Symmetry: C3
């Protein structure tokens, strides 16, 4: 484990995702509202999945070597197995908050799968220049997601209860800022141009992951928007 300088950030990430999972699990014990139960189930699964994948990276299972640039490059593939399941769950939290229609939910989840799937292909591609073709396709899929979150959901939240509109607006802004950083870290990190070393890259993804999952969840599950209007 300790033979890799980035191990400290993988261990911290593992701990923070595990602690986040347990807090949400305990906090959700005393909840019977069927609407609130939906948000607790979605939001608790997110850091639980991330916990297992951070642990796999810490123990060395989620790491492979990819030859490109005449070098064997360490690629943590477990990140994409994490994101494949956690990013659509996070979008479902937002879509259920605004009572989005089914067709829009399917478009979001499908574009998200394309985003993560093409990012994985780009991470494992051995022809250096082709890695950035996949990065560009994946980034186009992300821009579609961000467009929908702004010019489809925002207008839908305003016609909703005030507390669900204000909570959505906050979580929307958090998501757009944090998610946009991921393609940048990829491009300048060891998967892309190799400007930033792997140990610093790992620290950046850990800060982003914890903020986008645990921080996101703390804002959502403390809001009254997750409960139905009741007397």
């Amino acid at each position: 484990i300790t033979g890799r300088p980035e191990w400290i950030w993988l261990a911290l990430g593992t701990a923070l995702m595990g602690l986040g999972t347990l807090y949400f699990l305990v906090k959700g014990m005393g909840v019977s509202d069927p609407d609130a139960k939906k948000f607790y189930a979605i939001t608790t699964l997110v850091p639980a999945i991330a916990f297992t994948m951070y642990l796999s990276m810490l123990l060395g299972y989620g790491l492979t070597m990819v030859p490109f640039g005449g070098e064997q490059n360490p690629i943590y593939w477990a990140r994409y197995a994490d994101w494949l399941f956690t990013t659509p769950l996070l979008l479902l939290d937002l879509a259920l908050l605004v009572d989005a229609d089914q067709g829009t939910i399917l478009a979001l989840v499908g574009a998200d799968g394309i985003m993560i799937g093409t990012g994985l292909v780009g991470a494992l591609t051995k022809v250096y220049s082709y890695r950035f073709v996949w990065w560009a396709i994946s980034t186009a899929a992300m821009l579609y997601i961000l467009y929908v979150l702004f010019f489809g959901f925002t207008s839908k939240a305003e016609s909703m209860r005030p507390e669900v509109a204000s909570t959505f607006k906050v979580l929307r802004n958090v998501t757009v800022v944090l998610w946009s950083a991921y393609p940048v870290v990829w491009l300048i990190g060891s998967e892309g141009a190799g400007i930033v070393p792997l140990n610093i890259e790992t620290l950046l993804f850990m800060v982003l992951d914890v903020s986008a999952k645990v921080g996101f969840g703390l804002i959502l599950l403390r809001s009254r928007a997750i409960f139905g209007e009741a007397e």
Copy 2:
């Protein structure tokens, strides 16, 4: 790229799926009917997924070598990753058109997963004679799907609006004819008996894919069956 004679058909397929995706995306911009939005989302995702997998084959990522018959045989595995997601989406288009019940939808999607999954196992199997055992199981799963589309959905469409009944009947006939060709191309192509060479096999799958996805989508999204009855 150009070192493979089949590259021209992979490049054409990539272009036609990309163009198809963009047309459906633009055409769906001016749509607010929640029913129509469902069909546009399903139908636009189909060629978008196929685009990415054709590109992976063009660039050489979606290709592996499988030893059988005393030879290293080029097997494009990316086809099955495509079909795993696009064939159930196409069946969902048909099932939603006739307002199929949930139990029937689950049976269709499950049989479809078995069809594609066993076809993938057959494509990667190293014992030559066993490849055709998997082909037979996969073909049995397809025949179940075709039976349901005829002796379960057809009777349901007649009790529906006339425009949804006539549109379903057309898309049903297109699907049964085109899908039935796939097991035949597999059997006589490089995955099976090896009668037809890979470059011709690739041309045939490209014609079938574009027809079953883009051609299918053009018929559906030009129909009024996708809109609810409104004044």
Copy 3:
């Protein structure tokens, strides 16, 4: 095939899953109740999936070698591909029986995915002591599932029709007893401590699989709880 002593139990399992699939398929022909169709579709898919994965193990495709303990250990990875899809389908049978809320269904299916996913990682892990870390995480996920089936569903079934309450109680008890045996067989078998040899381990999993899928299905599909109350 016959070069492996466990082949006899893989062949028996294949036959019993295939026969089970055909019986459920025939029995479900004469069913039009939309509620009953749901249970028949879920319950017939379970042994059909298991059939294909037992066949892959029989023919040698679903087997790999994992080095640990200074030895190349035969690991049947196809079991986890089976369980990944069949265990959530079995939980869906139970959840639909008691009309569970959506949030609870998602929590069950998500915990089940974590259970199977971490068990697969543990089966393929090359550092011997780490294999049991994954076993423990997977077992914690199972205990969560069992808790929900007892202290969330049981109370919900009592407020239901008497026949659905008594049928659920029976299937609940069958599930908790049979599922609990799996982590024990893993721990003492070739994936874990290696006390029980592989051929005996394979026999035990076959008895458990057939009972948990075909036996489970025979109890459910003979009950009147799967039909709506009708005159």
